Write a protein that binds this ligand. Structure first.
Ligand SMILES: [Mg+2]
Ligand SMILES: [Mg+2]
Ligand SMILES: [Mg+2]
Ligand SMILES: [Mg+2]
Ligand SMILES: [Mg+2]
Ligand SMILES: [Mg+2]
Ligand SMILES: [Mg+2]
Ligand SMILES: [Mg+2]
Ligand SMILES: [Mg+2]
Ligand SMILES: [Mg+2]
Ligand SMILES: [Mg+2]
Ligand SMILES: [Mg+2]
Ligand SMILES: [Mg+2]
Ligand SMILES: [Mg+2]
Ligand SMILES: [Mg+2]
Ligand SMILES: [Mg+2]
Ligand SMILES: [Mg+2]
Ligand SMILES: [Mg+2]
Ligand SMILES: [Mg+2]
Ligand SMILES: [Mg+2]
Ligand SMILES: [Mg+2]
Ligand SMILES: [Mg+2]
Ligand SMILES: [Mg+2]
Ligand SMILES: [Mg+2]
Ligand SMILES: [Mg+2]
Ligand SMILES: [Mg+2]
Ligand SMILES: [Mg+2]
Ligand SMILES: [Mg+2]
Ligand SMILES: [Mg+2]
Ligand SMILES: [Mg+2]
Ligand SMILES: [Mg+2]
Ligand SMILES: [Mg+2]
Ligand SMILES: [Mg+2]
Ligand SMILES: [Mg+2]
Ligand SMILES: [Mg+2]
Ligand SMILES: [Mg+2]
Ligand SMILES: [Mg+2]
Ligand SMILES: [Mg+2]
Ligand SMILES: [Mg+2]
Ligand SMILES: [Mg+2]
Ligand SMILES: [Mg+2]
Ligand SMILES: [Mg+2]
Ligand SMILES: [Mg+2]
Ligand SMILES: [Mg+2]
Ligand SMILES: [Mg+2]
Ligand SMILES: [Mg+2]
Ligand SMILES: [Mg+2]
Ligand SMILES: [Mg+2]
Ligand SMILES: [Mg+2]
Ligand SMILES: [Mg+2]
Ligand SMILES: [Mg+2]
Ligand SMILES: [Mg+2]
Ligand SMILES: [Mg+2]
Ligand SMILES: [Mg+2]
Ligand SMILES: [Mg+2]
Ligand SMILES: [Mg+2]
Ligand SMILES: [Mg+2]
Ligand SMILES: [Mg+2]
Ligand SMILES: [Mg+2]
Ligand SMILES: [Mg+2]
Ligand SMILES: [Mg+2]
Ligand SMILES: [Mg+2]
Ligand SMILES: [Mg+2]
Ligand SMILES: [Mg+2]
Ligand SMILES: [Mg+2]
Ligand SMILES: [Mg+2]
Ligand SMILES: [Mg+2]
Ligand SMILES: [Mg+2]
Ligand SMILES: [Mg+2]
Ligand SMILES: [Mg+2]
Ligand SMILES: [Mg+2]
Ligand SMILES: [Mg+2]
Ligand SMILES: [Mg+2]
Ligand SMILES: [Mg+2]
Ligand SMILES: [Mg+2]
Ligand SMILES: [Mg+2]
Ligand SMILES: [Mg+2]
Ligand SMILES: [Mg+2]
Ligand SMILES: [Mg+2]
Ligand SMILES: [Mg+2]
Ligand SMILES: [Mg+2]
Ligand SMILES: [Mg+2]
Ligand SMILES: [Mg+2]
Ligand SMILES: [Mg+2]
Ligand SMILES: [Mg+2]
Ligand SMILES: [Mg+2]
Ligand SMILES: [Mg+2]
Ligand SMILES: [Mg+2]
Ligand SMILES: [Mg+2]
Ligand SMILES: [Mg+2]
Ligand SMILES: [Mg+2]
Ligand SMILES: [Mg+2]
Ligand SMILES: [Mg+2]
Ligand SMILES: [Mg+2]
Ligand SMILES: [Mg+2]
Ligand SMILES: [Mg+2]
Ligand SMILES: [Mg+2]
Ligand SMILES: [Mg+2]
Ligand SMILES: [Mg+2]
Ligand SMILES: [Mg+2]
Ligand SMILES: [Mg+2]
Ligand SMILES: [Mg+2]
Ligand SMILES: [Mg+2]
Ligand SMILES: [Mg+2]
Ligand SMILES: [Mg+2]
Ligand SMILES: [Mg+2]
Ligand SMILES: [Mg+2]
Ligand SMILES: [Mg+2]
Ligand SMILES: [Mg+2]
Ligand SMILES: [Mg+2]
Ligand SMILES: [Mg+2]
Ligand SMILES: [Mg+2]
Ligand SMILES: [Mg+2]
Ligand SMILES: [Mg+2]
Ligand SMILES: [Mg+2]
Ligand SMILES: [Mg+2]
Ligand SMILES: [Mg+2]
Ligand SMILES: [Mg+2]
Ligand SMILES: [Mg+2]
Ligand SMILES: [Mg+2]
Ligand SMILES: [Mg+2]
Ligand SMILES: [Mg+2]
Ligand SMILES: [Mg+2]
Ligand SMILES: [Mg+2]
Ligand SMILES: [Mg+2]
Ligand SMILES: [Mg+2]
Ligand SMILES: [Mg+2]
Ligand SMILES: [Mg+2]
Ligand SMILES: [Mg+2]
Ligand SMILES: [Mg+2]
Ligand SMILES: [Mg+2]
Ligand SMILES: [Mg+2]
Ligand SMILES: [Mg+2]
Ligand SMILES: [Mg+2]
Ligand SMILES: [Mg+2]
Ligand SMILES: [Mg+2]
Ligand SMILES: [Mg+2]
Ligand SMILES: [Mg+2]
Ligand SMILES: [Mg+2]
Ligand SMILES: [Mg+2]
Ligand SMILES: [Mg+2]
Ligand SMILES: [Mg+2]
Ligand SMILES: [Mg+2]
Ligand SMILES: [Mg+2]
Ligand SMILES: [Mg+2]
Ligand SMILES: [Mg+2]
Ligand SMILES: [Mg+2]
Ligand SMILES: [Mg+2]
Ligand SMILES: [Mg+2]
Ligand SMILES: [Mg+2]
Ligand SMILES: [Mg+2]
Ligand SMILES: [Mg+2]
Ligand SMILES: [Mg+2]
Ligand SMILES: [Mg+2]
Ligand SMILES: [Mg+2]
Ligand SMILES: [Mg+2]
Ligand SMILES: [Mg+2]
Ligand SMILES: [Mg+2]
Ligand SMILES: [Mg+2]
Ligand SMILES: [Mg+2]
Ligand SMILES: [Mg+2]
Ligand SMILES: [Mg+2]
Ligand SMILES: [Mg+2]
Ligand SMILES: [Mg+2]
Ligand SMILES: [Mg+2]
Ligand SMILES: [Mg+2]
Ligand SMILES: [Mg+2]
Ligand SMILES: [Mg+2]
Ligand SMILES: [Mg+2]
Ligand SMILES: [Mg+2]
Ligand SMILES: [Mg+2]
Ligand SMILES: [Mg+2]
Ligand SMILES: [Mg+2]
Ligand SMILES: [Mg+2]
Ligand SMILES: [Mg+2]
Ligand SMILES: [Mg+2]
Ligand SMILES: [Mg+2]
Ligand SMILES: [Mg+2]
Ligand SMILES: [Mg+2]
Ligand SMILES: [Mg+2]
Ligand SMILES: [Mg+2]
Ligand SMILES: [Mg+2]
Ligand SMILES: [Mg+2]
Ligand SMILES: [Mg+2]
Ligand SMILES: [Mg+2]
Ligand SMILES: [Mg+2]
Ligand SMILES: [Mg+2]
Ligand SMILES: [Mg+2]
Ligand SMILES: [Mg+2]
Ligand SMILES: [Mg+2]
Ligand SMILES: [Mg+2]
Ligand SMILES: [Mg+2]
Ligand SMILES: [Mg+2]
Ligand SMILES: [Mg+2]
Ligand SMILES: [Mg+2]
Ligand SMILES: [Mg+2]
Ligand SMILES: [Mg+2]
Ligand SMILES: [Mg+2]
Ligand SMILES: [Mg+2]
Ligand SMILES: [Mg+2]
Ligand SMILES: [Mg+2]
Ligand SMILES: [Mg+2]
Ligand SMILES: [Mg+2]
Ligand SMILES: [Mg+2]
Ligand SMILES: [Mg+2]
Ligand SMILES: [Mg+2]
Ligand SMILES: [Mg+2]
Ligand SMILES: [Mg+2]
Ligand SMILES: [Mg+2]
Ligand SMILES: [Mg+2]
Ligand SMILES: [Mg+2]
Ligand SMILES: [Mg+2]
Ligand SMILES: [Mg+2]
Ligand SMILES: [Mg+2]
Ligand SMILES: [Mg+2]
Ligand SMILES: [Mg+2]
Ligand SMILES: [Mg+2]
Ligand SMILES: [Mg+2]
Ligand SMILES: [Mg+2]
Ligand SMILES: [Mg+2]
Ligand SMILES: [Mg+2]
Ligand SMILES: [Mg+2]
Ligand SMILES: [Mg+2]
Ligand SMILES: [Mg+2]
Ligand SMILES: [Mg+2]
Ligand SMILES: [Mg+2]
Ligand SMILES: [Mg+2]
Ligand SMILES: [Mg+2]
Ligand SMILES: [Mg+2]
Ligand SMILES: [Mg+2]
Ligand SMILES: [Mg+2]
Ligand SMILES: [Mg+2]
Ligand SMILES: [Mg+2]
Ligand SMILES: [Mg+2]
Ligand SMILES: [Mg+2]
Ligand SMILES: [Mg+2]
Ligand SMILES: [Mg+2]
Ligand SMILES: [Mg+2]
Ligand SMILES: [Mg+2]
Ligand SMILES: [Mg+2]
Ligand SMILES: [Mg+2]
Ligand SMILES: [Mg+2]
Ligand SMILES: [Mg+2]
Ligand SMILES: [Mg+2]
Ligand SMILES: [Mg+2]
Ligand SMILES: [Mg+2]
Ligand SMILES: [Mg+2]
Ligand SMILES: [Mg+2]
Ligand SMILES: [Mg+2]
Ligand SMILES: [Mg+2]
Ligand SMILES: [Mg+2]
Ligand SMILES: [Mg+2]
Ligand SMILES: [Mg+2]
Ligand SMILES: [Mg+2]
Ligand SMILES: [Mg+2]
Ligand SMILES: [Mg+2]
Ligand SMILES: [Mg+2]
Ligand SMILES: [Mg+2]
Ligand SMILES: [Mg+2]
Ligand SMILES: [Mg+2]
Ligand SMILES: [Mg+2]
Ligand SMILES: [Mg+2]
Ligand SMILES: [Mg+2]
Ligand SMILES: [Mg+2]
Ligand SMILES: [Mg+2]
Lengths: 275, 48
RNA sequence: GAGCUAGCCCUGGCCAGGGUGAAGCUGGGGUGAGACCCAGUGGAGGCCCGAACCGGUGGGGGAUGCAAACCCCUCGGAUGA
RNA sequence: GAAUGCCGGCAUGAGUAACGAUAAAGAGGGUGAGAAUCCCUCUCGCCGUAAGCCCAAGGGUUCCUACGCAAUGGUCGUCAGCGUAGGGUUAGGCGGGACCUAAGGUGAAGCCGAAAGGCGUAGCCGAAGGGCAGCCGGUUAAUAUUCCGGCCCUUCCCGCAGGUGCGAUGGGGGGACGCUCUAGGCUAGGGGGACCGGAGCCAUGGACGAGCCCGGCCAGAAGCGCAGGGUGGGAGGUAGGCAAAUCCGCCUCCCAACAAGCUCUGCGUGGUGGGGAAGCCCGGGUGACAACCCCCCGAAGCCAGGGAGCCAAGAAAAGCCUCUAAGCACAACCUGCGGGAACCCGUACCGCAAACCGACACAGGUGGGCGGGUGCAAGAGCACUCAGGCGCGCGGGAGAACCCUCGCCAAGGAACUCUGCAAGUUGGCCCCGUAACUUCGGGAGAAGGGGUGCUCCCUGGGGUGAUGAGCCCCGGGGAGCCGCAGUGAACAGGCUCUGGCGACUGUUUACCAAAAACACAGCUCUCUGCGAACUCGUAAGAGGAGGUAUAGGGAGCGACGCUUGCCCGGUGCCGGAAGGUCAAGGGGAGGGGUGCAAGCCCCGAACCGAAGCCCCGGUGAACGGCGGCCGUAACUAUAACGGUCCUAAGGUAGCGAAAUUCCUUGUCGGGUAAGUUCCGACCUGCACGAAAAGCGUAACGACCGGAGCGCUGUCUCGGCGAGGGACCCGGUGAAAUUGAACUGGCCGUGAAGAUGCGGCCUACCCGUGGCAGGACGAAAAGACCCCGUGGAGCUUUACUGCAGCC
RNA sequence: CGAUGUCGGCUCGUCGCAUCCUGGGGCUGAAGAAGGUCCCAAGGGUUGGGCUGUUCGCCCAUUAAAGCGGCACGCGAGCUG
RNA sequence: UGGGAGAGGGUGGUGGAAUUCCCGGAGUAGCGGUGAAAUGCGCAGAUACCGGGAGGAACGCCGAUGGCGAAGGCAGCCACCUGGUCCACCCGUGACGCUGAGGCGCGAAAGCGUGGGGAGCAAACCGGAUUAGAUACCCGGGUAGUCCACGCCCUAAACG
RNA sequence: CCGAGGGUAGGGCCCGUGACUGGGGCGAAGUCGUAACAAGGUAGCUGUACCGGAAGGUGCGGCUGGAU
């Protein structure tokens, strides 16, 4: 659920905040945080390479365990559910009976004080991680690796999941969050359940001030600029686009497909996205 | 009103100084040039 | 050449005083249970008034200037992008 | 002899403007060749959240003293930030380094680039962040947390004593963190005292008095006290913290837990060391054996790493503690104590400024800390005033016009004008009261009105004490008094109705535009399956992102409400293994040159051979587009209806003389005595229209219209007054401009607007204050316009290339 | 074109006369009073407001009358903008 | 107290037929549609047939004139949670009852808001025919919607 | 002191009136089509929604007060 405000300022009329209800711990594990090096969009040359970034709240990066096959068979207790400013989903602190402490992204329905575990043998329960060839067809999954032992890459954002669809040889067929049908190697790991905090999408930032808190500087339309700046620049008065809608770099930006056609993964992608 | 020259000894030494020029091809040419011309000071005087 | 200016990054600092009184919390009323209503508490907000600080609205002066952008009066923001 | 030539020199303007804040001066006494200007005294004014003090930058001797006055100083100068000389800056504890890391920079390994060079995990460098041991007083012409005095402390080395498995660049803990609000107790700071100390005063009508005036503290080891911060203890198990581990983590059992204890800082106290006023006698002496006590106020500072709430979720590394590993366990480490040792650089002075940035001793700009008192509701606001600092480095007169800034005004009251521009009015606080409309918050300080000083009397609660007195805070009710007037000075909204545009707070053309422009939450399209797309780079490498489709890029639109119609023929984009066209290459029928030859060499057809284009289809919150004629109804008028040409299709809803309407001041209605503007309607809309969004919309606006009330020197229509200039005398003394000048009017003429030509008229010579009609006055080799086979920015289905992509 | 500042307004005027008013006249389809039309005449006079940047013009209330033109569409080293 | 029947309601699971799309096979000259046609689809390989896969909605026979509920209304099968109602015994209470202005709750469809889903169907819309014309009835397409959740709307030939 | 009332300011209700605009009633001697009554030539009616010169059409669900 999401929290509304009484309209006691013009911005509070629409602003909505996450209820933060599943949160049980307001501080991060000191051993699992390291400083997030803010870029502002600048690359190693000092040049802006992603526009309109910077000036958001300071953040510490919480180290996330995107492998899990690290610790096959060693169960852990869900010790807490925490806020992570570096991503949309929440994070759960796991205390491994090993004594080690690790963060995973919190699935939907994870309950503090529950057991989870990883391996070929794990039961098919929310929070457990297994290679795909041992998750039953139809079960919804998240934190899916793309290649064996290279780390979880798909279905990591709030509310998202991927669905096992069927086995073919060494591979499984998934429906990714985007509706894409893709093969993924069966030995790739994955974690049963969907990612939590599904109400993330219903947040209403409410004011220009909020975007700024997030490191998002104001976006300025090409239609607002001059010919030296943008294809849509200039015109006396307001002007329609007067050419096919283009990016600041000239390429067209309504419909032009941009994936590389000769990419080797085309062999593994079965059906392009829906919607 | 706030003007253009805002003296600052660290900034001065670190931008125009001897070790700054010596680290780049352009900087050494400045020194080769200013030595060939006979300048009394190859580099701005910074109090340090 | 970014010791002016623009943006970002790292690390510090500053914002008198007053006003408004959101959620929540307690009590009470209410109901089968509730929604909800009243009171107290509470102290929210690109909230209000106004110095510092940041601006530069309108008029006047200045115009070989005090000044190659200043001066006076008035005026905007002032916990926030 | 001319190049608005170049360099230099000297004129003109001219004894003219000006001498840099309108905070302000007067006299006496010294010094001296010389005095408005230097020094000293008295009087006066100005600052006092500074115009006082401290600190960091920056400046670099400007500091102090003697001696000077040519120049510098907007005058003067005997003075000085000026000339000459001499002197002056003292640290284990203050700041930086012999410590740590942040962005960033550099860079073993490694990667990349024609060269030069670009990157790059480790490491190193890098501070105003972390860390770390000094406080009070005195002293010099000039330095002081540095010298000295008193009282504390830190590290290193060596030695002694006790103690312990000692030992690290390695493991762990800690260091270690946001914003807003805030409790308790303290301190800084302050106010009062009828109490303590004090040189003296009694004026001019009264007063020898709870009289006046002055002051009544500072630092301090251990110990103790008060208030706080931090931390559970034991046992056992252990596969994790890239070795080890007794440490840390994880499980379990026992006891203790909001306590206590252990540890840590604050504050008080404290042996001891200091300070010590007014007044008056030449910075010094005395006051004085100074007193050094009580009550109230009270932090934003301290205890601190406190507490609570919230979402935007808030550095690192070392010092420190613990663990062990090699090793070493006659060593080593810890604890106490003692002796020794303790380096380098800075330290003067200015520092909101005459010493810094602005060419100047320049009304400008410059980061942090202290910033007293009284009154006004509060305050860093305002007035005055302490301490402290100033009167702004030209003066003296005069009392015109004119200018600036300021004050008032009879009757009228926006008649002013493009516009109430400007200036009035209003103005704080307390109480009463408050409309349409609304997104239910608002609109709202709406509007409008009442109160406001002082005296006496009764009285309610709170803070501190003790429950009381005293002090201080917040009230209440009566009865009176004065004046033109009680926020009696200063600081402090004019209000309303209605329309346009933009939802809103924000942002902008530094230095002519602050807006209706940009941004903005939000809406939609669209790309991207992760070595993502996209962006920077030749590349390596980076960003995106230590993110993963609830994500990231691109584009338009711009809160919210109700909505967003038709056209896919052209262009774009997407889909389409057919067909058509298609490059190198493949293929080699056939043809040629040459040789006696085998052979060498050259041309060359069908056929095979990609993307692209052509072809088929899809697609509008993709580029874009959205008709013309004739006829017809009980009068006319008009046409629901029929017809016809054209188109890819002919503009829907809603709005419309509009930020769009040419004709136009359309017509009608409203307001007005009168309304090219304004509002409300109509609709033949020159030339609206639905995300270059359409129509509305509460709130908001230094936006731009229109109207009214209040009030006014805006005006009728002007007057007077004030100060600073203008004027006169003394001092200093520019500027642009200038062919030379002995430089009048008219009517003519002249390259067509003549002081300079003709004719006539008028006119003794030379200045000072004023005014601006002329000298086609000055300034700038016209920005407009054109010309030049001049330039540069921008665009595209101009040409031709290139990167990029296929 | 090595610059002759451009609309309107305000201020200050001055001039022409083809005269708006006032003075003097002739003719009248001039009874009177009021007009019409032409002649003489430039001495003086020629209002205040609403609208619009406006010139001009309409409109309101008056008036003896609310004249038309020139002076670089008079006047920006006089102001406005 | 002991029993009964039932598509009453709520939640969560899962079963099969069929439609559509996509993949492979095979095959060729039309299919589809109507009163008759045409648009449309089809040699770029359709329809018909075989296998594989995805997805949504609705549940054939049982099913009846039946059953249930206050009404709206409820229909595959399984479980959980839960409502009303009938019978038999005649055990308990002792008129505790009937109605019901206001109030409160429920309330088909369509419609609304936020999100999701989207096979079939189908307002609007586009084309074909029919027709004197045909903004209709018929045909080929097609967006909301129809479905899920939560919140509204409160209507009806909500009828016996 | 109270006080008729007068003055300022802001509200509530009602009546008359208004450029223009919305439908309604009546008039009929017009134009257009033919929606309903027969199976009214697409059975009708219905709530709602979208649409069309007009009556009206269609979708969704409902009623029979529908001929065969
Ligand atoms: Mg939740
Ligand atoms: Mg809200
Ligand atoms: Mg709220
Ligand atoms: Mg709310
Ligand atoms: Mg709002
Ligand atoms: Mg919340
Ligand atoms: Mg949560
Ligand atoms: Mg760390
Ligand atoms: Mg990181
Ligand atoms: Mg990075
Ligand atoms: Mg770098
Ligand atoms: Mg570089
Ligand atoms: Mg940059
Ligand atoms: Mg970018
Ligand atoms: Mg950026
Ligand atoms: Mg951020
Ligand atoms: Mg989160
Ligand atoms: Mg969220
Ligand atoms: Mg949103
Ligand atoms: Mg955005
Ligand atoms: Mg934008
Ligand atoms: Mg622009
Ligand atoms: Mg550029
Ligand atoms: Mg270009
Ligand atoms: Mg371009
Ligand atoms: Mg353009
Ligand atoms: Mg244009
Ligand atoms: Mg433009
Ligand atoms: Mg235009
Ligand atoms: Mg523009
Ligand atoms: Mg534009
Ligand atoms: Mg615009
Ligand atoms: Mg254009
Ligand atoms: Mg366009
Ligand atoms: Mg175009
Ligand atoms: Mg792949
Ligand atoms: Mg600076
Ligand atoms: Mg300097
Ligand atoms: Mg420096
Ligand atoms: Mg620097
Ligand atoms: Mg250097
Ligand atoms: Mg030199
Ligand atoms: Mg030399
Ligand atoms: Mg140099
Ligand atoms: Mg910081
Ligand atoms: Mg502030
Ligand atoms: Mg309150
Ligand atoms: Mg609370
Ligand atoms: Mg504010
Ligand atoms: Mg405010
Ligand atoms: Mg400024
Ligand atoms: Mg200004
Ligand atoms: Mg003004
Ligand atoms: Mg003025
Ligand atoms: Mg001026
Ligand atoms: Mg100027
Ligand atoms: Mg000023
Ligand atoms: Mg000022
Ligand atoms: Mg002001
Ligand atoms: Mg303010
Ligand atoms: Mg404030
Ligand atoms: Mg505020
Ligand atoms: Mg603000
Ligand atoms: Mg010559
Ligand atoms: Mg010259
Ligand atoms: Mg010259
Ligand atoms: Mg010359
Ligand atoms: Mg010269
Ligand atoms: Mg001469
Ligand atoms: Mg002169
Ligand atoms: Mg001067
Ligand atoms: Mg001057
Ligand atoms: Mg003054
Ligand atoms: Mg004077
Ligand atoms: Mg003198
Ligand atoms: Mg003298
Ligand atoms: Mg003196
Ligand atoms: Mg003061
Ligand atoms: Mg200097
Ligand atoms: Mg000194
Ligand atoms: Mg000196
Ligand atoms: Mg001198
Ligand atoms: Mg001299
Ligand atoms: Mg001399
Ligand atoms: Mg001088
Ligand atoms: Mg000077
Ligand atoms: Mg002398
Ligand atoms: Mg001096
Ligand atoms: Mg000396
Ligand atoms: Mg010392
Ligand atoms: Mg050393
Ligand atoms: Mg280091
Ligand atoms: Mg440091
Ligand atoms: Mg000294
Ligand atoms: Mg000490
Ligand atoms: Mg020990
Ligand atoms: Mg040890
Ligand atoms: Mg260690
Ligand atoms: Mg941390
Ligand atoms: Mg920090
Ligand atoms: Mg804040
Ligand atoms: Mg006080
Ligand atoms: Mg205490
Ligand atoms: Mg172990
Ligand atoms: Mg003394
Ligand atoms: Mg003595
Ligand atoms: Mg004594
Ligand atoms: Mg404060
Ligand atoms: Mg805390
Ligand atoms: Mg959040
Ligand atoms: Mg934190
Ligand atoms: Mg770090
Ligand atoms: Mg050993
Ligand atoms: Mg050394
Ligand atoms: Mg030294
Ligand atoms: Mg010193
Ligand atoms: Mg000074
Ligand atoms: Mg200043
Ligand atoms: Mg300062
Ligand atoms: Mg100087
Ligand atoms: Mg200057
Ligand atoms: Mg200069
Ligand atoms: Mg001076
Ligand atoms: Mg100055
Ligand atoms: Mg003080
Ligand atoms: Mg006051
Ligand atoms: Mg006050
Ligand atoms: Mg103030
Ligand atoms: Mg005082
Ligand atoms: Mg003075
Ligand atoms: Mg002066
Ligand atoms: Mg005079
Ligand atoms: Mg008057
Ligand atoms: Mg008036
Ligand atoms: Mg009046
Ligand atoms: Mg006005
Ligand atoms: Mg006033
Ligand atoms: Mg006032
Ligand atoms: Mg009203
Ligand atoms: Mg008021
Ligand atoms: Mg208002
Ligand atoms: Mg009095
Ligand atoms: Mg007074
Ligand atoms: Mg004053
Ligand atoms: Mg005010
Ligand atoms: Mg209004
Ligand atoms: Mg608008
Ligand atoms: Mg705007
Ligand atoms: Mg705005
Ligand atoms: Mg709006
Ligand atoms: Mg805005
Ligand atoms: Mg603001
Ligand atoms: Mg802008
Ligand atoms: Mg500009
Ligand atoms: Mg500007
Ligand atoms: Mg400029
Ligand atoms: Mg400029
Ligand atoms: Mg501007
Ligand atoms: Mg503005
Ligand atoms: Mg904008
Ligand atoms: Mg929108
Ligand atoms: Mg590039
Ligand atoms: Mg890279
Ligand atoms: Mg990256
Ligand atoms: Mg990265
Ligand atoms: Mg990402
Ligand atoms: Mg907006
Ligand atoms: Mg915008
Ligand atoms: Mg509305
Ligand atoms: Mg149409
Ligand atoms: Mg098209
Ligand atoms: Mg097309
Ligand atoms: Mg085109
Ligand atoms: Mg082909
Ligand atoms: Mg051959
Ligand atoms: Mg659309
Ligand atoms: Mg077109
Ligand atoms: Mg378009
Ligand atoms: Mg049109
Ligand atoms: Mg119109
Ligand atoms: Mg309009
Ligand atoms: Mg138009
Ligand atoms: Mg026109
Ligand atoms: Mg017009
Ligand atoms: Mg016009
Ligand atoms: Mg008109
Ligand atoms: Mg009227
Ligand atoms: Mg107007
Ligand atoms: Mg018309
Ligand atoms: Mg338009
Ligand atoms: Mg546009
Ligand atoms: Mg527009
Ligand atoms: Mg509001
Ligand atoms: Mg505004
Ligand atoms: Mg504005
Ligand atoms: Mg006047
Ligand atoms: Mg006077
Ligand atoms: Mg005067
Ligand atoms: Mg005077
Ligand atoms: Mg005067
Ligand atoms: Mg001569
Ligand atoms: Mg001439
Ligand atoms: Mg002439
Ligand atoms: Mg003459
Ligand atoms: Mg001559
Ligand atoms: Mg002659
Ligand atoms: Mg002559
Ligand atoms: Mg004459
Ligand atoms: Mg003149
Ligand atoms: Mg003059
Ligand atoms: Mg002239
Ligand atoms: Mg002349
Ligand atoms: Mg002239
Ligand atoms: Mg002239
Ligand atoms: Mg000039
Ligand atoms: Mg030239
Ligand atoms: Mg020229
Ligand atoms: Mg020219
Ligand atoms: Mg020029
Ligand atoms: Mg021309
Ligand atoms: Mg040519
Ligand atoms: Mg030529
Ligand atoms: Mg060019
Ligand atoms: Mg590309
Ligand atoms: Mg010219
Ligand atoms: Mg010239
Ligand atoms: Mg000129
Ligand atoms: Mg008669
Ligand atoms: Mg005659
Ligand atoms: Mg006359
Ligand atoms: Mg005359
Ligand atoms: Mg006019
Ligand atoms: Mg004219
Ligand atoms: Mg006109
Ligand atoms: Mg007219
Ligand atoms: Mg009359
Ligand atoms: Mg008359
Ligand atoms: Mg004229
Ligand atoms: Mg003319
Ligand atoms: Mg003309
Ligand atoms: Mg003229
Ligand atoms: Mg003129
Ligand atoms: Mg002018
Ligand atoms: Mg003019
Ligand atoms: Mg003149
Ligand atoms: Mg004007
Ligand atoms: Mg203008
Ligand atoms: Mg049946
Ligand atoms: Mg019985
Ligand atoms: Mg009822
Ligand atoms: Mg319903
Ligand atoms: Mg429904
Ligand atoms: Mg609906
Ligand atoms: Mg579908
Ligand atoms: Mg027809
Ligand atoms: Mg629709
Ligand atoms: Mg919809
Ligand atoms: Mg029935
Ligand atoms: Mg009366
Ligand atoms: Mg019919
Ligand atoms: Mg029918
Ligand atoms: Mg029908
Ligand atoms: Mg029609
Ligand atoms: Mg239809
Ligand atoms: Mg029914």
């Amino acid at each position: 659920a999401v929290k509304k405000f009484k309209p006691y300022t013009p911005s509070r009329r629409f602003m909505t905040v996450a209820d933060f209800s599943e949160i049980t711990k307001t501080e991060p594990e000191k051993s699992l945080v390291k400083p997030l090096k803010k870029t502002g969009g600048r690359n190693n040359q000092g040049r802006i390479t992603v526009r309109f970034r910077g000036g958001g709240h300071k953040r510490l990066y919480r180290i996330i365990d995107f492998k899990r096959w690290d610790k096959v068979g060693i169960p852990a207790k869900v010790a807490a559910i925490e806020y992570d400013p570096n991503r949309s989903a929440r994070i759960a602190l796991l205390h491994y009976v090993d004594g080690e402490k690790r963060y995973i992204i919190a699935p939907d329905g994870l309950q503090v004080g529950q057991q989870v575990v990883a391996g070929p043998d794990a039961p098919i329960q929310v929070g457990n991680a297994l290679p795909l060839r041992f998750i039953p067809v139809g079960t919804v999954v998240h934190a899916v690796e793309l290649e064996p032992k290279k780390g979880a890459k798909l279905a990591r954002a709030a509310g998202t999941s991927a669905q096992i669809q069927g086995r073919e040889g060494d591979y499984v067929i998934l429906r990714l969050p985007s509706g894409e049908l893709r093969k993924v190697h069966g030995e790739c790991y994955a974690t049963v359940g969907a990612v939590g905090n599904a109400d993330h999408k219903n947040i209403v930032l409410g004011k220009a001030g909020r975007s700024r808190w997030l490191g998002r500087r104001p976006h300025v339309r090409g239609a607002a600029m001059n010919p030296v700046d943008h294809p849509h620049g200039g015109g006396e008065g307001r002007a329609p686009r007067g050419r096919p809608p283009a990016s600041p770099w000239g390429w067209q930006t309504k419909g032009l497909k941009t994936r590389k056609r000769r990419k080797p993964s085309s062999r593994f992608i079965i059906a392009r996205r829906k919607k | 009103m706030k003007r253009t020259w805002q003296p600052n000894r660290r900034k001065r030494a670190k931008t125009h100084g001897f070790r700054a020029r010596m680290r780049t091809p352009g900087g050494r040419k400045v020194l080769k040039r200013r030595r060939q011309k006979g300048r009394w000071r190859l580099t701005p005087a910074v109090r340090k």
